[PDB]
Structures are given as C-alpha cells and as structure tokens.
Design an enzyme around this catalytic site. Structure first.
Site, PDB file in Angstrom:
ATOM      1  N   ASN A   1       0.819  -1.231   0.000  1.00 26.47           N
ATOM      2  CA  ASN A   1       0.000   0.000   0.000  1.00 26.47           C
ATOM      3  C   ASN A   1       0.854   1.284   0.000  1.00 26.47           C
ATOM      4  O   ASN A   1       0.307   2.370   0.178  1.00 26.47           O
ATOM      5  CB  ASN A   1      -0.967   0.040   1.195  1.00 26.47           C
ATOM      6  CG  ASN A   1      -1.574  -1.289   1.570  1.00 26.47           C
ATOM      7  OD1 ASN A   1      -1.315  -1.827   2.654  1.00 26.47           O
ATOM      8  ND2 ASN A   1      -2.376  -1.855   0.673  1.00 26.47           N
TER       9      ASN A   1
ATOM     10  N   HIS B   1       3.082   2.235   2.229  1.00 27.91           N
ATOM     11  CA  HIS B   1       3.376   2.725   3.571  1.00 27.91           C
ATOM     12  C   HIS B   1       4.654   2.066   4.077  1.00 27.91           C
ATOM     13  O   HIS B   1       4.953   0.949   3.671  1.00 27.91           O
ATOM     14  CB  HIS B   1       2.231   2.398   4.530  1.00 27.91           C
ATOM     15  CG  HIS B   1       1.000   3.189   4.266  1.00 27.91           C
ATOM     16  ND1 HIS B   1       0.795   4.423   4.859  1.00 27.91           N
ATOM     17  CD2 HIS B   1      -0.044   2.912   3.451  1.00 27.91           C
ATOM     18  CE1 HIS B   1      -0.365   4.856   4.390  1.00 27.91           C
ATOM     19  NE2 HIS B   1      -0.911   3.974   3.544  1.00 27.91           N
TER      20      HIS B   1
ATOM     21  N   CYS C   1       5.891   7.250   9.507  1.00 27.66           N
ATOM     22  CA  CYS C   1       6.933   7.971   8.799  1.00 27.66           C
ATOM     23  C   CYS C   1       6.582   7.857   7.310  1.00 27.66           C
ATOM     24  O   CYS C   1       6.462   6.750   6.789  1.00 27.66           O
ATOM     25  CB  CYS C   1       8.302   7.359   9.110  1.00 27.66           C
ATOM     26  SG  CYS C   1       9.632   7.810   7.954  1.00 27.66           S
TER      27      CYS C   1
END
Ligand SMILES: Cn1ccc(C(=O)NC[C@@H]2CCCO2)n1
Ligand SMILES: Cn1ccc(C(=O)NC[C@@H]2CCCO2)n1
EC number: 3.1.2.14
Lengths: 263, 265
Positions: free
Chosen positions: B186, B188, B223
């Site tokens: 995804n 991330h 992050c």
C-alpha cells in the site's frame, strides 16, 4: 530444494510472501534477486560447500560478483509458487558463471531468467587473478557441455555499459546501508545495490511501467560506513543508464542499465 | 500453513534463509518480525479477510499497530525450521491483540514469543475509533472466547509505560530514510523498518558481544516515504537496558519510543 537427477543443477520452490510484493501485489525485483541468491546458496551446500573449495580456503580466495543480468516476463504474485533452477559453469580461466530459470509452479512456463559472472579475489588484499587449475578441477558439479540461460547471440547480458555523464537526469543522494542490508560476514548484500540503483528512477516511471531487464556491473564494494549517490538518465519502452558512486570522492562502485515496459 | 483443529489459531513452518541471518549465522529480529507478520497475514486470509471486515471496508476503517513486544530465547539458525502459532483476541472497545509463539520444529521447545496491540483508525482522517459492537461480533467468531495470552505472568514486561528519551541521547544514528524495499503493498513504511531504525543507534560493540533478548516498541505516528528519521539511544542500567526514540530529523516530531534488553553471549 534438491539437485536434479544428474546432480548438475538444483531446483527449489518458493511461495511469495506478503512483505515481498510491491504496490501491484507482485514480488519485487529485490525479492527475485534474494530468491536467486538463496537457491545458489542451497545448491553449493547440497554439493559439499560449507558456510569456496578446499584449495580456496587454504589460500584465502573468495568468489565476487562482477556482473548480474535479470530478465523478467511475469512477476510472481503474492501467494504464488515460483520454481527456480540454477547451475554453474566454468568460463575458462576468466572465472565462473551462474545461471537461473524462473518458472510458474502451476503452468510450468518460464516467467524470468538470470545470469551472473563471478571473479576470484583474495579476501584480504582484494586483488583478483584467476589461473588455479586445481580450483577449476574441483568442474565435477558443472555440465561439461554449455547450458546458457541466455543463449541468443547479440543478447542484452554481454553488452559494454558506458559511464553516466554529469549532470544526471535523476538522482537519489545520501544512501547508506543499515544492519539489515549487511550479510552474515558484515558485507553489504549485493541485492542492496539493485535497490539503490532503482532509487533514482522516478516514482511516476515505476507507477506506470514494469521492470523488464536489469544489467548491473559491480566495480567496488560499499563499506558499512560509506554513503552512496544514485544517478540516472533516460537513454531512449524506457531505457535508463545508471551510476552508483561514493558521496564524497565520487568513487565508482556500480554502473548499469534498466529497461521498462508500459503496463 | 493451516488453521489448528479448532479454527481459533494458525500455524506455519519457515526454513531460515541465507540472507535472513546476522554475523552469528542466526536469524535477525527483523527476520523474526517479518515471519510474525507473514503468519498473521496468512491467518487473516485463511478465515476470509483482505484484516478488514465488512463494516471496516464500508466505513474506511483500518487496524493500526499501537505496540509490539518480542521476547526471544533462541534465534533459529540458518537452515533451521521454525514453527509459529498465532491468534487474535478482542480487548473490549480498545482494539484487538495478536499473539505469537515461536517453536523449534525438531525439539518442540518455545524459542520465542510476541504480542501486539492494534487500534481502530479512519484510513483517511487518521482519527482513532473505539471498536463498535457490529465490528466486534464480525471477528469474535475467529477468536478464542477464554483468554489465551502468550505473556500471562502477573508482572509481564509487555504492559510497561515507556518514558520519553531526554536530550542529549547517549547514542544516535541520523539521516535515516526509507527506500522502496522498506515500503509495503500500500506504499506505507513497513512496521518492521522502525525496529531496524531503533537498533541503528545501538553501538556495534553492544551488538557484537550481546544477544537481543526483549524489544518493546510503541508506534506514535507513521513515517512518510519522503520523511527523514533520527534514532536516539541511552543505557538505563550481565544485562543491558536501553531507552529509544525515533523522531523526524526536522521538527523533532515523535514517531516511535521503545526499550530493548540485551544479555551477554
Ligand atoms: C572493496 N572491493 C574491492 C573490489 C570489490 C568488488 O567487489 N569488486 C568487484 C570485482 C572487481 C572487478 C570484477 O568484479 N570490493
Ligand atoms: C499519521 N498517523 C497517525 C497515526 C499513525 C500510525 O501509523 N500509528 C499511530 C497510532 C496512534 C495509536 C497507535 O497508532 N500514523
């Protein structure tokens, strides 16, 4: 994992893992590169090589990668099983070559293939040389007749890669490895250089294209305490010329070319 | 990989790979952390998920990790087979808990164990949700009704409040940024990357002479791909304790805090 009936090649099936895939839910080229390394490790163990030959340890010799060439036609999706067959051959008193064929466990079709060239070097002085006729003779684990994953004459794996001229079109600077990027001997895993090469490719290129070919020449190791700059320029499908160098003195560590196809 | 006879837990065997081990030829904590996430992913798929339910996909809700706690007694060596058993449980309206037990395929002894706490969150606005009753009943059928904790003990180290690291830190590793290999399907940053970044500030001499026994990590903020992290550490003690802190290199925004425990080899 097991040696084939003749004992002159090794096969292994791998189920693709959740953390091994990209945004398109298919395995990344770094996962493929890791799987090629794992099957090559297992092949060496199955024929009697501990964690190099007996003569190679007595002196202080190691096998280092000089070139890596990978062509993918279809990336295995998350959950798919991929079968990899690997084998080695002597490329005279120049060095050794290792080849791979990637297949689908269900269809049996070739979904990718790779080749790598390895040279001999002294562990400590880091020089090179390659003569050792006893090292050549201990050839019993290799096919005597040539068996090339890339047979075609005028193929992509034997082309001279030029050096990237400044200024580069794209760049990713300040790249340093972590402990996860190191191997069991504390050296930077040569799969990390592939990831660092592709760091300078723009996200829009990655989002709209799929990596078809990658050729990477290894010129020098990057130490744990070193910092790398990744440079790229379009040379055209999409072709790119690459260059990894030390952030400081600009010492060349890698050079390559990638080829991408529109999705 | 398969669900156990009762369908209330999942088991999976893993052969340790060449590139998965450290300098002492045993799997790294990041390889273990990857294997725990792989078995948890397979358990969710084997019961009919993609771990979002019908009400979660409907309301744009996601399960996010709030805390990870891992205790290892023996790291599987390169070539060894490790069996991991995982399971989920409801923790009321706070969220869910997932536990793991690591075992040796040959001896059958417990060589490690982990626990994680997950909170409900709107994928878009990031706002946390108190687990509703419709969602609670959707997954309660895949969970043991009686409590089954990998860390039962009346004073376990997986429920301790972690303090914030005070400046100046004893050790530090600055300028840490993720690459595409650190991202998930995804886009991330993988939760396992934060573990690797936490241990980047631990000195090499500590790693060379000690084994990582316990790690507790609290996730405060994700992050982004274009963010830069600073990893900070301070000794807080035959054993070694460390207090950790990950923060954004710029504004100093907290993203993670933790504690590790090391024992002499
Ligand atoms: C530190 N260091 C020196 C040389 C190397 C290395 O890996 N070089 C690859 C070799 C030399 C040319 C053929 O491939 N690393
Ligand atoms: C941008 N953002 C907000 C939250 C997160 C996240 O990934 N986790 C943190 C939350 C707070 C409780 C634990 O999960 N990222």
């Amino acid at each position: 994992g097991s040696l084939t009936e003749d004992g002159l090649s090794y096969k292994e099936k791998f189920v693709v893992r959740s953390y091994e895939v990209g945004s398109n839910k298919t395995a990344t080229v770094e996962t493929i590169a890791n799987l090629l390394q794992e099957v090559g490790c297992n092949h060496a163990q199955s024929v009697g090589f501990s964690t190099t030959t007996t003569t190679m340890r007595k002196l202080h010799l190691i096998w280092v990668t000089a070139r890596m060439h990978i062509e993918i036609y279809k990336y295995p999706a998350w959950g798919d099983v991929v079968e990899i067959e690997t084998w080695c051959q002597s490329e005279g008193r120049i060095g050794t070559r290792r080849d791979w064929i990637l297949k689908d466990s269900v269809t049996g079709e070739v979904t990718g293939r790779a080749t790598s060239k390895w040279v001999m070097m002294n562990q400590d002085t880091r020089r090179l040389q390659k003569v050792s006729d006893d090292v050549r003779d201990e050839l019993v684990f290799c096919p005597q007749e040539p068996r090339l994953a890339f047979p075609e004459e005028n193929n992509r794996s034997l082309k001279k890669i030029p050096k990237l001229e400044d200024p580069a079109q794209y760049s990713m600077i300040g790249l340093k490895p972590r402990r996860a990027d190191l191997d069991m001997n504390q050296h930077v895993n040569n799969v990390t250089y592939i990831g660092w090469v592709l760091e300078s490719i723009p996200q829009e290129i990655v989002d709209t294209h799929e990596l078809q070919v990658i050729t990477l020449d290894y010129r020098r190791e990057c130490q744990q305490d070193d910092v790398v700059d990744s440079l790229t320029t379009t040379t055209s499908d999409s072709q790119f010329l690459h260059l990894l160098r030390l952030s400081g003195d600009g010492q060349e560590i890698n050079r390559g070319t990638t080829l991408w196809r529109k999705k």
